[PDB]
Amino acid sequence: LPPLSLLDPAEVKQKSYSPESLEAMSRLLEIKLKEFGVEVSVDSVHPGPVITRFEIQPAAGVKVSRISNLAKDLARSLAVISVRVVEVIPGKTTVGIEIPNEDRQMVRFSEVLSSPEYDEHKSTVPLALGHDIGGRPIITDLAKMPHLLVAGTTGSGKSVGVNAMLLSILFKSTPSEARLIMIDPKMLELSIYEGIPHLLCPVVTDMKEAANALRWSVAEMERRYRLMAAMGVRNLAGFNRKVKDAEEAGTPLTDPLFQLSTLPTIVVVVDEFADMMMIVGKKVEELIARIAQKARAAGIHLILATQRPSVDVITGLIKANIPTRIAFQVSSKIDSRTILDQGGAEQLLGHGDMLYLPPGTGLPIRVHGAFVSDDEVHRVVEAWKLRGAPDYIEDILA
Amino acid sequence: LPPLSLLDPAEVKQKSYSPESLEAMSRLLEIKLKEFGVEVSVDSVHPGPVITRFEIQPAAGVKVSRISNLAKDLARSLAVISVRVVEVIPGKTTVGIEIPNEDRQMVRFSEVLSSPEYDEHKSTVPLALGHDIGGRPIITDLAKMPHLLVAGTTGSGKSVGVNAMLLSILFKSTPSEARLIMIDPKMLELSIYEGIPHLLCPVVTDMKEAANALRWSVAEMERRYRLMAAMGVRNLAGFNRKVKDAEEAGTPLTDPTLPTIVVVVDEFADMMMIVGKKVEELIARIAQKARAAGIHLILATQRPSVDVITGLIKANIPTRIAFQVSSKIDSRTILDQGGAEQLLGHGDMLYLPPGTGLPIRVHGAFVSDDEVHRVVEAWKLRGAPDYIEDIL
Amino acid sequence: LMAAMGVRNLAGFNRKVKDAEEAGTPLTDPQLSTLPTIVVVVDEFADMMMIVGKKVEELIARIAQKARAAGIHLILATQRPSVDVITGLIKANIPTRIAFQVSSKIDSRTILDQGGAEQLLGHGDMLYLPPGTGLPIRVHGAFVSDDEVHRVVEAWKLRGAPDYIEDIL
DNA sequence: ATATATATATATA
DNA sequence: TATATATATATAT
Ligand SMILES: Nc1ncnc2c1ncn2[C@@H]1O[C@H](COP(=O)(O)OP(=O)(O)O)[C@@H](O)[C@H]1O
Ligand SMILES: Nc1ncnc2c1ncn2[C@@H]1O[C@H](COP(=O)(O)OP(=O)(O)O)[C@@H](O)[C@H]1O
């Protein structure tokens, strides 16, 4: 296994944010909202890496839409790019306002991996997203999502996020524990990964080959459900603990359908499925529907990224069974209601700010995506090419 | 290599855009905004060749939308033709107001090429386009686009702009470093480029030779990726450095410099639907795969349509040029937000960068047929190129 | 023939005609005479494009995309400003449009791509939309009676026999 | 009290 | 079916 020292290590941050600067910014926000119609008093300050949440208590008898309908003007009168108004804070009467700082600290990916969450995270598919608005990291199990949608316009830090997720997979799991399928219609980003032992296929370029790979994944899901029926288990981890119990007693439990092995966790990533549904058509959308409908228990998981949030790409069928959404900076509030099904995705800053939406109804966790460099990615790729051979299958492309 | 003096020389340096005249304009703007409900205060003044930016400082309480929803009346009462309100200036607390200036000045192309951004440039295929709001030039780079759709109607800026791009190819590079392929089912516009040493074929008249040229380009893409998989090379300039090190050593190479290829089409609208939609898969495979090979596309059409500019061509080309399609309604076919709303026909354009954001305000620098024909004859003094019959 | 002669428009080829026997120096046939400017008037292309189909629209689009520097022009007249007649094919290629009194703003957006055509006072009072600037220029129509038409037809029939290319049909 | 902004309702590409 | 336009309604003036 690769160590945690291949990365560029933890840097020294420019933490010069004094309490007198916080008091000055608090009084400045009080004045600049008093100059408009509202009147508000700053309650407390949460300083952070990239943004700085202010908990402001409104006056007696002033609404919150009269704060949300001038977020642009409050951002203009403070010499910042854009402010974000959190309309509800769980457990308090205060309204949140998050102002970007000046010395925007780059989130160090080695600081994200150095957490007590990620270090003893037992699951074979973790995701180190990055630090949230208050400094601590957010590590999310990819098994429990079970799938993922990523969006945001170009240059808003999206391939960096997908590379952070794939390196989050690579620093924990062997090719006997996890396994990947990659699709790339734009060979700049994902072609750096061709050679790692966690692959089943060459990095898929054409869309007919990608349709063949997704039909192979349907067939693999169906035969895994039939094999779990033939062994009488319920989920994938139950089958892996069943064959582990066969390993513990030294007892060979043979093939129920003709010796079994620990089936690794397939993860199917897609760089741009908008091009896929635009080239091939509605049957690819129904194929992703038939994947997302059932493959939670079989251990086949989806990472979907797109650059075109619309009704044509992010449809009802894709939003049917993929409830976990990553949204970077997008253009309109209509696109925010397209992916996150609510406003608020447009207020971000670029450079990998995402609104993590967990599975289930909740306020979106604003997580700053950790920057990963081409040198670190290339070093992980070369370490796995020096510690692993490819495991290809011819049938996945035909 | 022709000098920059074969262009027409720099025109009359128009003075009398004085600080007292712009101060009178700024006080006029303060008075005309004070007559309505708002109160404004001009902070600084950014002049320019075509238009002028006024960084105004709004007072306490006045919103931006109050300024934006009377812009028609403000542009009426300033004796100007239009106005635009830049709602955000990064890092400053000031709203930008864009006012068209008095003399709609033409951008001189020698004023574009004389800047050190073009002269000390490092790549081989730049596209000098024009200036900003303040007159500082914007010299882009075609190697990072990596493909460039041009579309528009009504004879707006298109053929002059494509000539400016191809001259930006001409003035820097040699044919050994950057070749060209030209395709035009119109026999008219780009026929003046016949005989220049940067080409590879005649200016294509029979569209079956255009399909065979694109077929040769696809096979060239295939053999260049076979070359790079035989050499372990990501993008073309790495192999150019490797063959430079093999040329310093005289080292021959195996059979699995390479010329940079830029293919233009001016009327693929009727061509792609009459010759066959099999052309579109060729164009999409080139624009997908050959973005690291060196085969770049300056695609141009006279009819920007949903039929001929589909999503299949929108996929691999995120760097777009649109002058006048009809309006901001059918704009989303090529420029995804909005098009000919304040593009003044012959001139200003919207350059969509390889990233995104507010796209670049680019004034289309003028080129004339004397300059075009003179650069063509100056390169025809350097020689006639190689012509491949398999392309034809 | 203009690609053979290296000519950049029609007016350049009439300048080649001025280089020909107009200035007293005859040419060859690669003696090329004048190529006359053709103004093809169509009184009702709605009937044509609803009866015979869309291949006529393919022909009209291949003309209207290209024929400025050619020597063939079209005055298209109709009575249905609708998508059933005027599609987007014959929209972006004819940027100069005459709009008389129509009965809806929808038809005004169908032809002029804006509003204000149904407001006209009738009887030839049109909205000349010039090329380039997409702003309407309102023009009152000039009345010419049928007797003046018979006079001009008589004045041309008393001067020249019909010079036909009869094989057009 | 009433011009403005806006959410929705019907007609069309 | 997505959208451009049109009409009735809070809203703060
Ligand atoms: N966490 C981060 N810190 C700093 N910069 C970032 C971060 N994430 C992304 N970026 C910047 O954003 C850019 C990534 O854009 P990207 O989303 O890959 O474009 P596209 O959507 O076209 O693939 C990079 O150039 C990088 O500089
Ligand atoms: N910088 C400029 N200044 C003034 N006019 C320009 C400039 N650039 C282009 N033009 C005008 O553009 C016209 C040519 O349009 P063109 O590019 O041929 O459109 P199309 O190719 O659609 O016919 C010329 O009349 C020329 O005057």
Author numbering:
A (entry chain C): 315 to 572, 583 to 722
B (entry chain B): 315 to 570, 586 to 721
C (entry chain A): 541 to 570, 583 to 721
Text from the published report:
Among them, the bacterial protein FtsK is unusual in that it translocates on double-stranded DNA and is also the fastest known translocase. Its C-terminal cytoplasmic domain, which follows an often very long linker domain, can be subdivided into three modules: α, β, and γ, with β adopting the RecA-fold that contains the ATPase activity. Upon recognition by the γ module of one direction-determining sequence in the genome, named KOPS (FtsK-orienting polar sequences), α and β oligomerize as a homo-hexameric ring around double-stranded DNA (dsDNA) (forming FtsKαβ-dsDNA).
Overall, three main particle classes could be distinguished, II.A, III.B, and III.E, each accounting for 4.9, 4.3, and 5.2%, respectively, of total particles selected after 2D classification and pruning for highest quality. States II.A and III.B were reconstructed to 3.99 and 4.34 Å resolution and are in very similar conformations.
